[PDB]
Design a protein around this ligand. Structure first.
Ligand SMILES: NC(=O)c1ccc[n+]([C@@H]2O[C@H](COP(=O)([O-])OP(=O)(O)OC[C@H]3O[C@@H](n4cnc5c(N)ncnc54)[C@H](O)[C@@H]3O)[C@@H](O)[C@H]2O)c1
Ligand SMILES: NC(=O)c1ccc[n+]([C@@H]2O[C@H](COP(=O)([O-])OP(=O)(O)OC[C@H]3O[C@@H](n4cnc5c(N)ncnc54)[C@H](O)[C@@H]3O)[C@@H](O)[C@H]2O)c1
Ligand SMILES: NC1=NC(=O)C(NC(=O)Nc2ccc(C(=O)N[C@@H](CCc3nnn[nH]3)C(=O)O)nc2)C(N)=N1
Ligand SMILES: NC1=NC(=O)[C@@H](NC(=O)Nc2ccc(C(=O)N[C@@H](CCc3nnn[nH]3)C(=O)O)nc2)C(N)=N1
Lengths: 296, 295
């Protein structure tokens, strides 16, 4: 028993090639080349890196892009004015605001200002609602990337035990929603039995649910939250965390999972970096071509 | 140990008393008396009784009501024009369409046709999204009733293990949403550790999670789903089911083996008289919220 390491990087690169073919055919049919606009506020270094990866991926798949960078001191009204400009620009197919934003800007007001037709993050209240009702919607990139990892790997979900650690509205909540819901609904779900945990779940209780799990998805942002004692043998372990830590001098990226210990016990495991992160970027490229195609 | 049998009838009475004081103050300050309209389609006997309980409760808390009964042969179009007229009648503060609807009518189109400011059921896609984002919203009556039973009985949720059986969009899902979410958010949650189960959860796996639970909430519509062996001693067991069965004559039971589980649990809700009356009571609360226009 040693875990298969699922390369999120490799799977993402493949999906990007699928999107490239689709974009290139869309353009060859006489359509406007798709354009993604990303708004970046302030100087969070994680945000700058993730956004650079989004724009590199857009170039790879033939989508035009711009990153618009504003100071953290921008007002909410100034950001709204920019959004309304880009909502009215017929060259822009996809529009997203990188999170998190400064405290003085209301994130949900910003997310709801993006025209739902251009809402490639799936964060507008109508996309959130439709998703929670298992209707067709623009799915958020990270949750859909987690789903794609599980399904493209052929890891089964129907009747299975799943634990999600984390309940954030952009990651943990939608993963739990996708995994537990009906396969027969308009937007199929995974028909798993899902346990959601969070900052007030006691360690010992997390463990008692993880030990029954066929799939553990950690989305908490806590190094070594998940260790091999907490995992049953042959389980799939998906690490959504991206934690900036220091070593052994260097700054470095680790996940929520003790990768070395857990790879001895799990059947499957994703690494950090190169796991869920690149899949987030690929699923965004998928949403952008879907948005440009005005099919939803 | 013998479980405390929580009385849904008594808790509902306290909530309705609160709504009557709030309504009477509101009107005494010179405001329009609240008005609830209910649309009832067809002849489902449960739907009729439930709507009659809602309009009786409205009258005793000072809320005006009308029930508009339409035949099952109604078209989706005819239903939509009735909703539109009610959305544009400024006397109407609250509007709901009793479910289930006939098979030729798309329930989702109907729920989204009610104006969100009159959507006392909380079933419009905007209320569902807001709720799932922990924002201020009209909470659905049955899920909010489950919350109030737990909170007013003083059963703790923060850090506790909860299992919900059922994943329906109007009942099981919102209950799981209220119970797991953050106590500090705009619309507070219970901060519990929540497992959701459904028709593809094997019985064995259900038991392995319920056996760990401090609170088991059953919303599946299946007699004797929850039996004493499935429950941790001292646990709260909340029974949302309302099933019609046969007795040594016709009878109503929940999802819980009441006689059995009552010995094991620390708290249990009966059926009838548990969650049902709370469903009615929380609708009265949403109706006064709608009339005040605070959202
Ligand atoms: N593509 C990717 O791989 C990707 C994308 C975005 C964010 N992230 C990473 O994922 C994490 C989650 O995303 P977010 O930005 O929504 O986070 P967030 O800051 O909103 O909070 C994450 C969650 O962690 C939970 N938590 C804290 N302690 C816990 C414990 N002991 N057990 C279980 N849960 C606990 C909190 O209750 C909260 O829901 C981040 O911290 C970041 O490291 C990864
Ligand atoms: N105030 C109240 O007490 C109130 C309000 C509404 C409905 N109800 C009752 O609840 C019943 C069902 O309501 P609903 O909205 O859940 O209807 P529904 O049929 O849409 O949902 C039933 C749910 O039960 C699940 N289920 C089926 N078998 C299961 C199993 N073995 N284990 C776990 N879950 C299982 C299904 O996956 C589904 O999500 C109704 O028949 C009604 O009697 C009560
Ligand atoms: N739009 C909409 N919104 C909803 O909210 C809906 N749900 C709903 O109305 N539920 C509900 C409302 C009331 C009662 C109730 O009074 N229960 C009593 C009597 C039991 C009884 N059985 N037969 N006669 N009486 C008890 O349990 O004690 N129970 C359930 C729905 N179906 N549609
Ligand atoms: N509006 C909005 N939408 C979103 O989707 C959001 N989430 C998001 O962008 N997530 C994300 C995007 C990209 C990557 C990524 O490229 N990961 C690499 C490591 C890269 C790296 N290099 N140095 N530090 N990190 C890896 O994991 O291998 N990781 C996460 C969000 N915050 N806001």
């Amino acid at each position: 028993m040693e875990a298969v390491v699922i390369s999120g990087r490799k799977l993402a690169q493949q999906i990007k090639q699928e999107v490239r073919q689709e974009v290139e055919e869309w353009v060859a049919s006489g359509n406007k080349r798709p354009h993604l606009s990303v708004i970046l506020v302030g100087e969070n270094p994680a945000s700058h890196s993730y956004v650079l990866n989004k724009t590199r991926a857009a170039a790879v798949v033939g989508i035009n892009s711009e990153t618009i960078m504003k100071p953290a001191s921008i007002s909410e009204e100034e950001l709204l004015n920019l959004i309304n400009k880009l909502n009215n620009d017929d060259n822009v197919d996809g529009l997203l605001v990188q999170l998190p934003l400064p405290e003085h800007i209301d994130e949900r007001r910003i997310c709801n200002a993006v025209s739902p037709d251009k809402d490639v993050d799936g964060f507008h209240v109508i996309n959130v609602g439709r998703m929670c009702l298992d209707q067709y919607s623009m799915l958020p990139a990270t949750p859909w990337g987690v789903w794609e990892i599980i399904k493209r790997t052929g890891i089964p979900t129907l009747g299975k035990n799943v634990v999600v650690a984390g309940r954030s509205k952009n990651v943990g909540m939608p993963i739990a929603m996708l995994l537990h819901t009906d396969g027969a609904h308009e937007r199929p779900g995974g028909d798993a039995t899902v346990t959601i945990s969070h900052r007030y779940t006691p360690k010992e209780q997390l463990k008692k649910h993880t030990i029954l799990a066929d799939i553990v998805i950690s989305a908490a942002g806590i190094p070594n939250l998940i260790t091999a004692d907490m995992i049953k043998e042959g389980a799939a372990v998906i690490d959504v965390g991206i934690n900036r830590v220091h070593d052994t001098a260097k700054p470095k990226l680790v996940g929520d999972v003790d990768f070395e210990g857990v790879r001895q016990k799990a059947g499957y495991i994703t690494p950090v970096p190169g796991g869920v992160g690149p899949m987030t970027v690929a699923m965004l490229m998928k949403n952008t071509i879907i948005a440009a195609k005005k099919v939803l």
